[PDB]
Structure formats: structure tokens, C-alpha cells
Paper text:
By using functional proteomics, we and another group independently identified a piRNA biogenesis and chromosome segregation (PICS) complex (also named as PETISCO) that plays important roles in 21U-RNA biogenesis, chromosome segregation and cell division. The PICS complex is composed of TOFU-6, PICS-1 (also names as PID-3), ERH-2 and two mutually exclusive factors, PID-1 and TOST-1. The PID-1 containing complex is functional in piRNA maturation and processes piRNA precursors at 5′ termini via its association with IFE-3, while the TOST-1 containing form is essential for chromosome segregation and cell division in embryos.
Given that the two structures are almost identical, the native one was used for structural analysis. α1 of TOFU-6C interacts with α2 of PICS-1A via both hydrophobic and electrostatic interactions. Asp26 and Gln34 of TOFU-6C form salt bridges with Lys246 and Gln254 of PICS-1A, respectively. Asp12 and Asp67 of TOFU-6C form salt bridges with Arg263 of PICS-1B.
Residue numbers in the entry:
A (entry chain C): 200 to 281
B (entry chain D): 201 to 281
C (entry chain A): 6 to 92
D (entry chain B): 5 to 45, 53 to 91
Amino acid sequence: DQENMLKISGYPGMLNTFGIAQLLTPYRVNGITITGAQSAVVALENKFQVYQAVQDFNGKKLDRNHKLQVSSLVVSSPAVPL
Amino acid sequence: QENMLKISGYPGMLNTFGIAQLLTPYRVNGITITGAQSAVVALENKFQVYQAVQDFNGKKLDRNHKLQVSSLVVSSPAVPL
Amino acid sequence: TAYYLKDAGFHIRNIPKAWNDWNLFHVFQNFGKVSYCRVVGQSNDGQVQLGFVNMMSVADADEVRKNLNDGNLIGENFTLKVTDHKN
Amino acid sequence: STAYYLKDAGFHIRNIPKAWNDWNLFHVFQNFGKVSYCRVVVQLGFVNMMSVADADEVRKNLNDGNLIGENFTLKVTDHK
């Protein structure tokens, strides 16, 4: 299910899956997939939490050495203009 | 044993990721759920446990939830402060 | 019908017929973070829709309530009937 | 998951009074922020703060790298 997913990277490399979940507070995390990478693919509750997480966290400076990168296939798609 | 803390009082909906989110920024290594609103949590070491109990015991999350956070850990300096 | 954070959700009635869930969402996002946002049915010949919106926290829900006028959310060009979800 | 703790957040401590244990060292540093790790080996020690922000505050309270209390002077250096 495509629109529950975001990619996050640029977080400190020592984080475990709980620590990646802490990054995303307060959004509901249902799954984290860790690979050989220093990125992770995270499943959130739904497209609205994904949309808000990308907003909140993409580009966020954690400190002088870590600027998060967060991205997803989710585009805000109102039926009528706002 | 000194890595453990007991946490309870959070919303009953939280999965274990949500319980770990409560303890930001302390490092969580394992969570064992012991009720609808209670869990045993393994943190990184005793100083994070001690600090977590300080920051979060009695913390009011909202008007319907108050955390009770406890541990076996006590501050035991060899020389007084 | 599902597990929700006490005092954080709202039932919406009288939603304009052309909105989808993104419209509904963007309305409540102006007051705080949103957990669940859903169009749950139609009503009055199909002319208005019913909705449900759960906020990320009670604080966020109370931020919605503070902008409420006798149970109604007045915006530019719409009025929704917002009602506290009780468990 | 990497092998190394967070960057710019650790310190090496020399000049620790010999009677101190980890709890004594811990409490000195807790005054500047949350502490992630704390060990003693006069004696040497290591303290990692929870974040760079905490550890920078530690750095904001130094004199040519020294932490001065009433009965002690710890020599403190960045773990890089």
C-alpha cells in the first residue's frame, strides 16, 4: 500500500528502529524497514500522516551534522481548490 | 535489570513504536507490553533509566492520561555532591 | 467502530458535496495535526456528506473547539457541523 | 545501524578525583543537559551527552577546556 510509505534519511547512523520511530513523533508508525542503507522506509498510519511528516521533517536540521530528508509518493489532492 | 523501567498510563491505542515515542530522546532497546496501558521498557543504560523516570513520572499527557514511570535505579555516588 | 484517542475526534455533517477527504483534511489542518480524516457517507439526496476527523492530540482537538460557534465551524464559503466524538 | 555514537556529542575526561565513581561524574554533567553514557576507568572518564545541543552547552561552560567545581577541576576534550 503505496501512500502509507515515506523515505527518511540523514538521521544519525546509530539509531535503531525505535530511534527512527522517535524521529517521527507524534505520527503513528506501523512498520520500519531497514536495509543496508542509512535510510529507512517507514509505513505510517495513512496518507495524511505521511503528508504531514514530509512537511514537518523534510529539511529539518537536527544539528550541524544532520539535515533530514523525507519524501513520499503522496500529493495533496483536493477535489475543489482550497 | 538496571536497564529496565516500567511505564503505564499512556493511551491504550499506542503500539510499541508509540510507547518508544513517549520516551524521546532516550534510546529504547526493547519493549514488552504488560497490559492495555502498561509496558516494561529496556533503555540503553541506568543513567537513561534514571533520567527517564525523572522526566516522565507523573507527566500529564492530556486530561485523560498521566504516566506512572518507575525503576529499580537509584543515584549512588561514591562521594556526596 | 475503532480505537481512537479519547476527546480527540469529531463527527462532521453538512460537508459540501464536491469535497473529497483532502478538502476535509486541509480544513482541520489549519488547527493542528490530523490523525484520521474520512468521508463516511452521503446525505440529503447526495447534497452534503458526512465526515469524521481525529486530531493528533487532545490539545489539537481543543484548538478546533476554540474556533467553534455553537457546534459549527464557519469558514469562508462553508459551514460544517462539528460534534465531539464520544467513545 | 552504525557502530559510532552521535557526532560532536562525546567528551573525554581527565583529572577525575580518585574517589568518584560513574554516578559522581554523571551528576556533574547532568547540570548541562541529558546524559547518554558515563563511565570512569586520579582517573579518566567518558561522557556522551544526549545531543549536540546539550554538549554545546557543556562547551559554553569551560575555561581552556576545564570544568571547575568547588573541590575539582576536570580536563575535558571533544571526542572527534
